[PDB]
Ligand SMILES: O=c1ccn([C@@H]2O[C@H](COP(=O)(O)OP(=O)(O)O[C@H]3O[C@H](CO)[C@H](O)[C@H](O)[C@H]3O)[C@@H](O)[C@H]2O)c(=O)[nH]1
Ligand SMILES: O=c1ccn([C@@H]2O[C@H](COP(=O)(O)OP(=O)(O)O[C@H]3O[C@H](CO)[C@H](O)[C@H](O)[C@H]3O)[C@@H](O)[C@H]2O)c(=O)[nH]1
Ligand SMILES: [Mn+2]
């Protein structure tokens with residue numbers, strides 16, 4: 001459930017928070033609109049697990065595996081079993097044009113998987129963009145009655161470390177690993193005023209990654225419907241945003257600030273970026289792929 | 297309103313958040329359960345004001361002025377007019393045994409004051425403790441229909457600097473200025489197991505002050521009803537907590553973690569504690585009083 005009567009926490013023994021010691025001295029841990037930025041060292045997972053288990057929380061995880069991307073599912077789901085919301089109720093929603101090709105992955109107790117058959121668009125850009133419409137369409141079909149939160153991710157990924165209830169909040173985005181240290185003018189927002197995703201050079205908080213966003217079902221429905229409607233306006237005007245759904249996600253989260261922001265621990269590419277000191281954990285990472293080959 | 301459809305923020309020009317620069321290097325700015333700890337330098341008030349004005353937010357402020365404490369009202373209310381939620385809708389609720397003695401303070405537009413007549417208990421301890429019952433009783437009489445958030449404060453105080461929408465959240469407490477740097481064993485929690493307010497030596501996050509707490513009307517109703525019911529159990533068992541309502545507030549907020557914590561900028565005593573470097577602003581401060589004299 002979300003927003004229901006909360007019972008009391010049990011007695012717990014844990015280290016006292018240190019008011020006069022910053023939890024991180026190297027990174028920003030709260031946005032200017034008072035949303036936590038989630039890094040290792042900012043949270044006590046024992047306290048959070050108690051809070052969310054007492055609310056009987058169910059987390060949905062959406063993933064699209066269309067055309068050749070079915071190949072990514074086995075590692076994605078295996079590693080999600082090891083690292084994603086372990087101990088909590090989970091419902092995986094695998095959207096695919098090939099149900100027969102979803103691997104039989106053994107799930108832990110309290111975890112379930114549904115296969116949702118959808119059409120396959122020809123262009124990879126359209127496959128990626130139409131996720132917003134598809135997630136929105138399923139936010140009445142299933143999600144509102146089945147889960148409390150939705151987490152929406154790319155499939156060409158693997159979990160390597162804990163991803164848990166510390167992410168859960170009404171609306172979150174994730175810092176894209178290529179831009180967390182960049183100035184806003186260097187962010188690859190859409191810069192053409194003719195697109196609904198347009199963001200001027202002097203605006204922007206962060207560059208959020210298309211590959212990991214989420215929130216309550218209500219907030220995810222809002223986000224995905226808004227991004228889809230914006231993409232349909234652009235299509236009618238003969239323009240396609242520079243980074244497709246990611247461009248529209250960024251416009252939405254500029255104008256509707258997230259209530260948590262995930263650090264790049266939650267969206268990383270070790271091949272391209274290594275393992276910087278500022279990353280104490282690499283939680284959810286890109287898997288190698290010949291992009292051109294696998295998209296066609 | 298709270299929790300209603302939020303429109304989009306307008307374009308705004310402000311400094312980019314710095315992911316690789318902490319906003320404070322000297323203090324903890326987020327609790328281990330991911331609640332912001334509100335210090336100067338953690339928030340951009342322009343962004344927050346937009347968010348809360350677009351939701352048409354109304355803030356109630358409760359204050360008790362019973363017996364001789366009517367003397368504190370003029371400065372309290374004058375200074376609240378200069379510093380408290382300016383630009384937002386405010387409803388002051390002055391609880392008193394002497395309506396005739398409430399000063400005629402000129403209010404800004406969009407701000408109103410109601411006088412609520414209540415009984416005066418003999419012992420100052422009872423006056424202080426019975427605020428929980430009284431706030432709870434008024435959470436159906438008025439607050440649910442009149443305000444979005446409630447802020448509940450001591451009257452023997454003055455505002456010296458901004459106290460605004462950065463505090464607003466479902467449930468908040470405030471770090472007591474005498475204990476923010478103290479170890480939990482030094483916190484003056486109730487330590488007798490016979491009291492409902494009992495907290496063992498190895499438990500506790502913070503020592504919250506009785507003089508400044510709040511949240512949504514729903515959460516404040518929960519807190520104040522729980523503290524009152526706990527105080528009635530103690531009374532039936534012939535025990536009175538060491539710091540009265542503050543002891544019960546601390547037990548409640550240990551077991552029901554606040555969604556923001558206010559720094560001691562929001563609850564200070566300059567006579568007793570000076571102006572430490574760690575306090576960039578002194579927002580809400582004790583006024584001098586001969587405690588014994590004014591309480592009897
Ligand atoms: O044939 C395809 C193409 C794409 N996808 C789905 O679409 C997602 C995004 O496509 P890629 O992973 O191929 O592309 P990138 O990793 O470059 O994607 C990044 O840029 C995209 C926009 O160009 C999106 O915003 C995406 O979320 C972001 O991680 C995939 O993970 C997969 O879930 C398929 O299922 N099949
Ligand atoms: O004759 C009285 C006595 C008290 N009060 C009200 O009760 C509040 C609390 O009493 P004091 O301010 O006299 O006491 P302290 O500042 O020592 O209070 C601190 O300790 C108290 C418990 O002992 C409460 O928790 C309180 O919120 C906390 O700031 C006052 O501000 C006032 O609002 C009156 O109105 N009249
Ligand atoms: Mn990808």
Ligand SMILES: [Mn+2]
Pocket residue numbers: 450451452507
């Ligand atoms: Mn006081």
